[PDB]
Scaffold this active site. Structure first.
Site, PDB file in Angstrom:
ATOM      1  N   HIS A  64       0.817  -1.130  -0.062  1.00 16.70           N
ATOM      2  CA  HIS A  64       0.017   0.180   0.124  1.00 16.70           C
ATOM      3  C   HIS A  64       0.955   1.102   0.108  1.00 16.70           C
ATOM      4  CE1 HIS A  64       0.754  -0.908   4.249  1.00 16.70           C
ATOM      5  NE2 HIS A  64       0.756   0.268   4.395  1.00 16.70           N
ATOM      6  N   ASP A  71      -0.030  -8.113   5.410  1.00 18.55           N
ATOM      7  CA  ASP A  71      -0.006  -9.586   5.236  1.00 18.55           C
ATOM      8  C   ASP A  71      -1.239 -10.300   5.376  1.00 18.55           C
ATOM      9  OD1 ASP A  71       1.011 -10.244   8.862  1.00 18.55           O
ATOM     10  OD2 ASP A  71      -0.583  -9.175   7.897  1.00 18.55           O
ATOM     11  N   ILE A  76       0.396  -8.875  11.362  1.00 16.49           N
ATOM     12  CA  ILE A  76       0.308  -7.421  11.582  1.00 16.49           C
ATOM     13  C   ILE A  76      -1.135  -6.985  11.473  1.00 16.49           C
ATOM     14  CG2 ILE A  76       1.459  -5.540  10.816  1.00 16.49           C
ATOM     15  CD1 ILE A  76       3.282  -6.935  12.476  1.00 16.49           C
ATOM     16  N   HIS A  79       0.443  -0.420  11.436  1.00 18.78           N
ATOM     17  CA  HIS A  79       1.875   0.199  11.920  1.00 18.78           C
ATOM     18  C   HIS A  79       1.595   1.597  11.731  1.00 18.78           C
ATOM     19  CE1 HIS A  79       2.820  -1.042   7.587  1.00 18.78           C
ATOM     20  NE2 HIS A  79       2.425   0.393   7.390  1.00 18.78           N
ATOM     21  N   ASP A  90       2.040   8.896  10.136  1.00 20.80           N
ATOM     22  CA  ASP A  90       0.917   8.269   9.797  1.00 20.80           C
ATOM     23  C   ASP A  90       0.656   7.031  10.331  1.00 20.80           C
ATOM     24  OD1 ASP A  90       0.990   9.666   6.316  1.00 20.80           O
ATOM     25  OD2 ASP A  90       0.983  10.815   8.181  1.00 20.80           O
ATOM     26  N   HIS A  92      -1.617   3.265   9.865  1.00 19.96           N
ATOM     27  CA  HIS A  92      -2.012   2.589   8.913  1.00 19.96           C
ATOM     28  C   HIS A  92      -2.576   1.334   9.439  1.00 19.96           C
ATOM     29  CE1 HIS A  92       1.217   3.223   5.683  1.00 19.96           C
ATOM     30  NE2 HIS A  92       0.593   4.288   5.886  1.00 19.96           N
ATOM     31  N   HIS A 114      -2.492   2.660  20.343  1.00 19.72           N
ATOM     32  CA  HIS A 114      -1.229   2.008  20.298  1.00 19.72           C
ATOM     33  C   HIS A 114      -0.505   2.741  19.117  1.00 19.72           C
ATOM     34  CE1 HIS A 114       1.745  -1.431  20.401  1.00 19.72           C
ATOM     35  NE2 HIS A 114       1.607  -1.251  18.922  1.00 19.72           N
ATOM     36  N   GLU A 115      -1.227   2.755  17.931  1.00 16.46           N
ATOM     37  CA  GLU A 115      -0.570   3.244  16.833  1.00 16.46           C
ATOM     38  C   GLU A 115      -0.174   4.833  16.934  1.00 16.46           C
ATOM     39  OE1 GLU A 115      -0.081  -0.202  15.517  1.00 16.46           O
ATOM     40  OE2 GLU A 115       0.797   1.354  14.697  1.00 16.46           O
ATOM     41  N   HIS A 118       2.614   5.436  18.728  1.00 18.40           N
ATOM     42  CA  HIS A 118       3.798   5.452  17.627  1.00 18.40           C
ATOM     43  C   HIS A 118       4.038   6.708  16.833  1.00 18.40           C
ATOM     44  CE1 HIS A 118       4.947   1.274  18.234  1.00 18.40           C
ATOM     45  NE2 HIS A 118       3.793   0.789  17.763  1.00 18.40           N
ATOM     46  N   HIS A 124       7.567   0.469  21.569  1.00 25.62           N
ATOM     47  CA  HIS A 124       6.995  -0.591  22.371  1.00 25.62           C
ATOM     48  C   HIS A 124       7.564  -0.799  23.707  1.00 25.62           C
ATOM     49  CE1 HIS A 124       6.034  -2.793  18.335  1.00 25.62           C
ATOM     50  NE2 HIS A 124       4.957  -1.949  18.894  1.00 25.62           N
TER      51      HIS A 124
HETATM   52  C1  LIG Z   1      -2.684  -2.446  20.553  1.00 30.30           C
HETATM   53  O1  LIG Z   1      -2.293  -2.211  19.467  1.00 30.30           O
HETATM   54  C2  LIG Z   1      -1.609  -3.132  18.505  1.00 30.30           C
HETATM   55  C3  LIG Z   1      -1.242  -2.770  17.460  1.00 30.30           C
HETATM   56  C4  LIG Z   1      -0.752  -3.667  16.518  1.00 30.30           C
HETATM   57  C5  LIG Z   1      -0.208  -5.103  16.985  1.00 30.30           C
HETATM   58  S1  LIG Z   1       0.600  -5.988  15.823  1.00 30.30           S
HETATM   59  O2  LIG Z   1       0.333  -7.268  16.178  1.00 30.30           O
HETATM   60  O3  LIG Z   1       0.264  -5.579  14.599  1.00 30.30           O
HETATM   61  N1  LIG Z   1       2.070  -5.551  15.832  1.00 30.30           N
HETATM   62  C6  LIG Z   1       2.807  -4.648  15.175  1.00 30.30           C
HETATM   63  C7  LIG Z   1       2.899  -3.145  15.646  1.00 30.30           C
HETATM   64  O4  LIG Z   1       3.577  -2.966  16.607  1.00 30.30           O
HETATM   65  N2  LIG Z   1       2.228  -2.092  15.073  1.00 30.30           N
HETATM   66  O5  LIG Z   1       2.268  -1.241  15.853  1.00 30.30           O
HETATM   67  C8  LIG Z   1       3.111  -5.983  16.965  1.00 30.30           C
HETATM   68  C9  LIG Z   1       4.430  -6.938  16.773  1.00 30.30           C
HETATM   69  C10 LIG Z   1       4.146  -8.315  15.895  1.00 30.30           C
HETATM   70  C11 LIG Z   1       5.576  -6.934  17.354  1.00 30.30           C
HETATM   71  C12 LIG Z   1      -0.511  -5.371  18.225  1.00 30.30           C
HETATM   72  C13 LIG Z   1      -1.049  -4.418  19.045  1.00 30.30           C
HETATM   73 CA   LIG Z   2      -2.769  -8.590   8.950  1.00 28.58          CA
HETATM   74 CA   LIG Z   3       2.349  12.784   8.212  1.00 29.04          CA
HETATM   75 ZN   LIG Z   4       1.755   1.376   5.756  1.00 27.82          ZN
HETATM   76 ZN   LIG Z   5       3.167  -1.231  17.655  1.00 35.20          ZN
END
Ligand SMILES: COc1ccc(S(=O)(=O)N(CC(=O)NO)CC(C)C)cc1
Ligand SMILES: [Ca+2]
Ligand SMILES: [Ca+2]
Ligand SMILES: [Zn+2]
Ligand SMILES: [Zn+2]
Ligand SMILES: [Ca+2]
Length: 159
Positions: A64, A71, A76, A79, A90, A92, A114-115, A118, A124
């Site tokens: 994207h 995936d 995932i 992110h 951003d 996604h 969580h996003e 980031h 993390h």
């Molecule tokens: C509470 O919010 C979350 C968001 C994404 C994930 S995830 O599993 O996609 N993951 C990717 C990530 O951190 N994106 O921010 C973790 C991982 C597989 C290390 C897990 C929890």
């Molecule tokens: Ca996925």
């Molecule tokens: Ca931006």
């Molecule tokens: Zn992306």
């Molecule tokens: Zn994360």
């Protein structure tokens, strides 16, 4: 410390909306997720409906446009990029997940908290109570709170 926004007034825009949820419910989840972070920092978030925003919220699948293809269902979920211009900031969300208001599928609000962490510069956490701990776990949304580690983290970056 990693990148931070060099300003406390930060804009966001929702690029597109998952069909998994009603539009109003997406707006609400995202607003509430920004509010979680606004409530423990000097940061002020402004939603823009049109134009240039710092944090773009995107729902997309597979490859994207960034160098981080999704995936399919599971794996995932989402992110986000740390603070910076363009794609910086951003957030996604993988459209191959089933985004929800509740404990079924993947809760958009909790994932967005969580996003956005980031998007503001957090990495993390090793605290399993932290929203920044990298495993998705549903917790009651009405009683959700940032852990002490999440608050330490974000206050170390801003204020
Ligand atoms: C509470 O919010 C979350 C968001 C994404 C994930 S995830 O599993 O996609 N993951 C990717 C990530 O951190 N994106 O921010 C973790 C991982 C597989 C290390 C897990 C929890
Ligand atoms: Ca996925
Ligand atoms: Ca931006
Ligand atoms: Zn992306
Ligand atoms: Zn994360
Ligand atoms: Ca979906």
């Amino acid at each position: 410390m990693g990148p931070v926004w060099r300003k406390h007034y930060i804009t966001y825009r929702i690029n597109n909306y998952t069909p998994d949820m009603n539009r109003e419910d997406v707006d609400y989840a995202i607003r509430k997720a920004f509010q979680v972070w606004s409530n423990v920092t000097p940061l002020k978030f402004s939603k823009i409906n049109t134009g240039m925003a710092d944090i773009l919220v995107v729902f997309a699948r597979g490859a994207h446009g960034d160098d981080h293809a999704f995936d399919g269902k599971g794996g995932i979920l989402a992110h986000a990029f740390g603070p910076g211009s363009g794609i910086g900031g951003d957030a996604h969300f993988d459209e191959d997940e089933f985004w929800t208001t509740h404990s079924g599928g993947t809760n958009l609000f909790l994932t967005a908290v969580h996003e956005i962490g980031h998007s503001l510069g957090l990495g993390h956490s090793s605290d399993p109570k932290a929203v920044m701990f990298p495993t998705y776990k549903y917790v009651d949304i009405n009683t959700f709170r940032l852990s002490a580690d999440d608050i330490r983290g974000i206050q170390s970056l801003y204020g």
